[PDB]
């Protein structure tokens, strides 16, 4: 039985996502232009920096997130940012040509664009496999926003101080998701869906680790760091 509180949580997270995800991609006009030599790094750095801002806006609305300390909020957002950005991007991902389609040919990104921002197949191949496996789950929007929120509020992130409180907040979201699947996701799509969604969170930890490796090699070169944004430098490191 989906309790009234659990329905409330889902409503909050759906609204938070709708307030922090613009499916018209209007703000892409503001980014440095894509050029198709790490020719896509300025554009995709701007895209990521933009997405970081939106992920923070979503995080602030997760029930219980505001009850954490400032330090724990920062630690969770720093460690989860690239994972939530990858999850968030799955909305625009299409399996029809394995690309992130953001409304325009100019704003349609394939594996070549990603390598033109400085990343390598060590990241890109598992990243495509993730996007495909996530897309095949055909998540309800309710489950998509719950998974983003569970990803953010993870008690085993490095540098978490109040792990017991983070865990208490995550457990409320996890039980909401488990009960939503049981009561609202019909079979056969519901089959071991919770375990499959948690497996995706495990995949994101591995993607996070490889992204940070490649980011460090990328940003170690000052010529590359010059093309990043100040927010990206603060979040992913200097």
């Amino acid at each position: 039985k989906l309790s009234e509180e659990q329905q409330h949580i889902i409503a909050i997270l759906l609204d938070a996502h709708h307030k922090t995800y613009d499916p018209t991609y209007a703000d892409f006009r503001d980014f440095r232009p894509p050029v198709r030599p790490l020719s896509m790094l300025p554009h995709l750095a701007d895209l990521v920096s933009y997405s970081i801002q939106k992920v923070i806006g979503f995080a602030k609305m997760i029930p219980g997130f505001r009850d954490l300390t400032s330090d724990d909020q920062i630690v969770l957002l720093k460690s989860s940012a690239i994972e939530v950005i990858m999850l968030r991007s799955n909305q625009s991902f299409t399996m029809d040509d394995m690309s992130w389609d953001c409304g325009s040919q100019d704003y349609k990104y394939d594996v070549t664009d990603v390598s033109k921002a400085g990343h390598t197949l060590e990241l890109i191949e598992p990243l495509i496999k993730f996007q495909v496996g996530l897309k095949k789950l055909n998540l309800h929007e309710e489950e998509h926003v719950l998974l983003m929120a569970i990803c953010i509020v993870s008690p085993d992130r490095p540098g978490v101080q109040d792990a017991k409180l983070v865990e208490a907040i995550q457990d409320r979201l996890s039980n909401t998701l488990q009960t939503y699947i049981r009561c609202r996701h019909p079979p056969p799509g519901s089959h071991q869906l919770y375990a499959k969604m948690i497996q995706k969170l495990a995949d994101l930890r591995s993607l996070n680790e490889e992204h940070s490796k490649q980011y460090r090699s990328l940003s170690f070169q000052p010529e590359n760091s010059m093309k990043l944004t100040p927010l990206v430098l603060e979040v992913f490191g200097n």
């Binding site: 801002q53 923070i56 806006g57 602030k60 400032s70 920062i74 957002l77 720093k78 927010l231 603060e234």
Partner: peptide
């Protein structure tokens, strides 16, 4: 330390 993160969180 994290002034832009902290400002976007307020």
């Amino acid at each position: 330390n994290h002034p832009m993160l902290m400002n976007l969180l307020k």
